[PDB]
Design a protein around this nucleic acid. Structure first.
Lengths: 171, 159, 100, 426
DNA sequence: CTAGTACCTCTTAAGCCTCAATAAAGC
DNA sequence: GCTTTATTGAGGCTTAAGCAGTGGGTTCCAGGTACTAG
């Protein structure tokens, strides 16, 4: 959850790409991997900082192959949700089972059984929405919900949350 | 199992390793500091690309979007969504405010995650803060918690 | 081919059954009005050479204590004719059905 | 009655003796014959052997009921294939189960049940069971019997007993053969779950609702809710791919997600649709498919060649199959649609020997006039093995004269190419 | 009747247990 | 003073080891016996 840490990445380069610009090319391949990466082990990688200060270790030459393996260590900021935390997001879609909330690079789902009794789904408005005795929820709304479970995908992270404690919901 | 009771995983230890092997204390950041570091990284990337090639909620969003498109644009569509999420409901817009906030949070000396949550999440009552983080119950005095909460509320930018 | 009687379990060649029949159950078969072949089956498991049926506990277990010494089958598949069963109120099939 | 047959130490005493396996029946018969002979000969003095038996499931051992071990040792002395030394006493409590008949593995036969004949390996249906429980009637597939073919071929041995009853070679009903065979010869919402059994076996999804033992889960593969019995789901801790399918006589598609009975396929027009296994007429063999196209630059492109689009995203990938007006290309750098996309050929750029088997004579070389047998041609040169030399030499075919299988006249490389390939006349 | 089908059949190096003596502790 | 101890060692039996490479010519589809399908 917004943590800065050092990550080591091993990059293989063909010996043909050995000119002075190779560094830049290598950096490009770094920009095509860290961005959009989502691994359960390290969570979701948010950004990489200090591009000009990136230090690359001496490349490793395979015993027989001509490829060069460079181990680059870089400081990067990553995001990873944890159970019991509360985060705010925006409703992206509505469904009978509930409404999905986009928060950061991730999605959150709220179980119907864990919803306020007053809150009730209604299809009389286009698009369908939810009506509460003291709150209003629509597609364009900032909703703060507590995350109770996390699911890790190959390249995605899903959260399961609920709104039962006070001060939750629309704000 | 990971939860809010400080039972971090095998890798989220209180201490972190450095490139030189030195051991340091884990450091966290808030939304404003995250945006600041992201902007600095984008500026550095833009400068690197330029040198290599050489030889109010309405205008800032457009500038950020065009900057993202110019560098590291098109590789993934999730970056734009994350940037919009961070920018739409941010709290601090000035570097001085976030600097003061982090300096004040440093004096507390609490866990980085707890201070990050306090600086990011908004609270108004002691009971609400305690129930929000039951683990951090017998760690911060009520008077200190109230003082830091009111200081954070006052430091909030008026957009 | 060797067949084992479904009543007493005695195992003998088909020729012996055709010629002399079962030495221990010929009278019962004649009374029931059925042939020896219908009261014998070719499928059997295990062989028992009984020497002293009167003094052998195995014979009592197999209900062949009153039978003569010879070859008998522990388990015999098939069912006797209904006439034979009616004449034997306490008959127990040797196929393992009543060994629960 | 059986309650009074419980064995006791003073009444039952059976010793087990090791023997060569499989010889249980023969050994028992031999021992019984020896006992009878001893009883007939010795007379009053008879060895105290009450019974000798064996169990089929327990090979390599026999059981003898005698009051003393010495009697058994004396009786079995000198009998081959019996190890008298390797013997053990059977405890009384173990005696009953030893003589207890083994539970036959054959399930109780019932009318309409399906069994396998030990027509070996052919499924059969139990129609009727004899009152003696010795023979059972089995209905089997003979391909179904065809009365027309039987009448055409072997009408002599074919008889008709009813509108649907035919007898052939001594009984066929409804195209099936009835024959007699011996019995001995015959969860919480949000939990990750996976289907282990049922029609949707192998499907994985996230549970949403549970009620009355039925669990409903949203499946990622189908993106729809499926309700299955709880016992058929397991909680998991959190045609093949790229094959070419001929949907119709003019429709060819490439699979992007190969399932059990559901296949997602992209057609030549680029539309991706989900179909069933039956919608696929047959699988097109890419290796055996001799289909080629022309790119924008005019260079011939075949299956497997790497091509890059000239316009668009310049996607680079290997061609899997070539359509009349489209080409399917799989790229390892694209995850969308399993990396398979359909592109027009014009929008991409690439990154019969008569001499063989006939005797010949060389004309202009160091081996001119020497008989040779043509093995293979690599193009503009023919490899020939010399009859008198154990070596193969490559020489231009145009300077070689061909002869008939048996003698004949010599012809240069100007008649076979022009005239139909035929050996001369001897 | 006749023929498938299966089922039975020379020179050393270490470990360990087993032998014959020997000085001390119990009593 | 006598009896019973832990220890010392010494061989029988046992289980292991047993140059490198390569060319060739022969033989196995195993024997009998019982049970069962055409």
């Amino acid at each position: 959850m917004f943590f800065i840490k050092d990550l080591s990445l091993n990059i293989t380069l063909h010996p043909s790409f050995f000119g002075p610009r190779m560094k830049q090319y290598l950096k490009t391949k770094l920009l095509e991997e860290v961005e959009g990466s989502c691994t359960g082990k390290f969570g979701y990688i948010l950004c990489v900082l200090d591009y000009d200060n990136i230090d690359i270790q001496r490349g490793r030459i395979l015993p027989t192959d001509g490829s060069a393996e460079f181990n680059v260590k870089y400081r990067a900021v990553v995001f990873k949700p944890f159970k019991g935390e509360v985060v705010d997001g925006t409703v992206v879609s509505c469904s009978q089972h509930g409404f999905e909330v986009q928060v950061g690079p991730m999605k959150v789902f709220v179980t119907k059984h864990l919803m306020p009794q007053d809150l009730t789904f209604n299809a009389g408005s286009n698009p369908p929405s939810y009506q509460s005795s003291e709150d209003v929820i629509t597609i364009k709304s900032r909703i703060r919900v507590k995350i109770e479970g996390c699911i890790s995908q190959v390249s995605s992270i899903h959260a399961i949350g609920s709104i039962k404690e006070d001060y939750l919901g629309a704000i | 199992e990971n939860a809010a009771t400080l039972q971090l995983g095998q890798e989220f230890q209180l201490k972190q390793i450095n490139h030189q092997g030195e051991e340091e204390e884990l450091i966290a950041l808030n939304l404003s500091e995250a945006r600041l570091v992201i902007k600095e990284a984008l500026v550095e990337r833009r400068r690197a690309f330029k040198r290599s090639q050489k030889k109010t909620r309405e205008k800032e969003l457009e500038s950020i979007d065009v900057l993202l498109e110019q560098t590291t644009g098109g590789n993934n569509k999730d970056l734009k969504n994350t940037m919009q999420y961070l920018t739409n409901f941010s709290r601090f817009r000035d570097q001085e405010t976030v600097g003061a906030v982090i300096q004040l949070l440093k004096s507390t000396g609490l866990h980085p995650f707890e201070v990050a949550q306090l600086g990011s999440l908004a609270c108004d009552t002691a009971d609400e803060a305690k129930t929000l983080i039951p683990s951090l119950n017998n760690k911060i005095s009520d008077d200190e918690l109230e003082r830091i909460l009111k200081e954070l509320s006052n430091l909030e930018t008026l957009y | 081919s060797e067949r084992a009687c479904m009543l007493c379990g005695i195992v003998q060649t088909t020729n012996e059954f055709n010629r002399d029949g079962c030495p221990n159950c010929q009278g019962i078969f004649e009374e029931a009005g059925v042939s020896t072949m219908e009261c014998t089956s070719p499928s059997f498991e295990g062989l028992v050479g009984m020497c002293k049926p009167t003094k052998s506990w195995v014979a009592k277990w197999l209900s062949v204590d009153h039978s003569i010494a010879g070859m008998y089958a522990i388990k015999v598949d098939g069912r006797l004719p209904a006439e034979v069963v009616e004449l034997l109120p306490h008959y127990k099939p040797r196929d393992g059905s009543q060994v629960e | 009655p059986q309650r009074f047959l419980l064995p006791s130490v003073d009444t039952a005493t059976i010793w087990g003796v090791r023997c060569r396996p499989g010889k249980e029946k023969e050994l028992i018969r031999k021992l019984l014959k020896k006992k009878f002979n001893l009883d007939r000969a010795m007379g009053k003095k008879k060895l105290k052997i009450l019974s000798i038996f064996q169990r089929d499931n327990y090979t390599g051992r026999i059981y003898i009921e005698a009051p003393k071990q010495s009697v058994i040792e004396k009786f079995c002395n000198g009998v081959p294939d019996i190890y008298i030394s390797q013997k053990l006493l059977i405890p009384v409590q173990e005696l009953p189960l030893l003589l207890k008949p083994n539970k036959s593995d054959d399930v109780a036969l019932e009318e309409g049940s399906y069994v396998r004949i030990k027509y070996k390996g052919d499924l059969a249906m139990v129609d009727q069971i004899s009152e003696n429980n010795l023979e059972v009637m089995l209905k089997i597939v003979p391909q179904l019997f065809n009365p027309t073919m039987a009448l055409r071929l072997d009408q002599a041995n074919l008889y008709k007993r009813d509108d649907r009853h035919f007898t052939y070679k001594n009984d066929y009903i409804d195209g099936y053969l009835y024959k007699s065979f011996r019995i001995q010869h015959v969860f919480e919402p949000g939990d990750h779950v996976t289907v282990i059994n049922g029609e949707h076996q192998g499907d994985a999804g996230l549970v949403l609702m549970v009620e009355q033992g039925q669990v409903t889960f949203m499946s990622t593969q189908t993106s729809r809710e499926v309700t299955i019995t709880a016992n058929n789901l397991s909680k998991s801790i959190d045609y093949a791919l790229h094959d070419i399918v001929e949907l119709s006589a003019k429709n060819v598609a490439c699979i992007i997600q190969a399932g059990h009975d559901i296949f997602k396929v992209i057609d030549e027009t680029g539309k991706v649709s989900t179909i069933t296994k039956g919608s696929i007429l047959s699988k097109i063999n890419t290796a055996r498919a001799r289909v080629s196209s022309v790119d924008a630059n005019g260079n011939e492109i075949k299956i497997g060649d790497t091509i890059v689009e000239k316009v668009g995203s310049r996607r680079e990938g290997q061609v899997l199959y070539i359509q009349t007006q489209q080409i399917f290309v799989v790229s390892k750098k694209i995850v969308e649609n399993a990396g398979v996309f359909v592109v027009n050929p014009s929008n991409v750029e690439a990154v019969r020997e008569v001499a063989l088997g006939k005797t010949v004579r060389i004309r202009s070389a160091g081996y001119k006039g020497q008989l040779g047998i043509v093995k293979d041609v690599n193009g503009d040169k023919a490899t020939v093995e010399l009859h008198s030399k154990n070596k193969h030499i490559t020489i231009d075919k145009h300077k070689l004269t061909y002869y008939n299988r048996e003698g004949g006249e010599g012809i240069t490389y100007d008649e076979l190419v022009n005239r139909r390939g035929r050996v001369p006349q001897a």
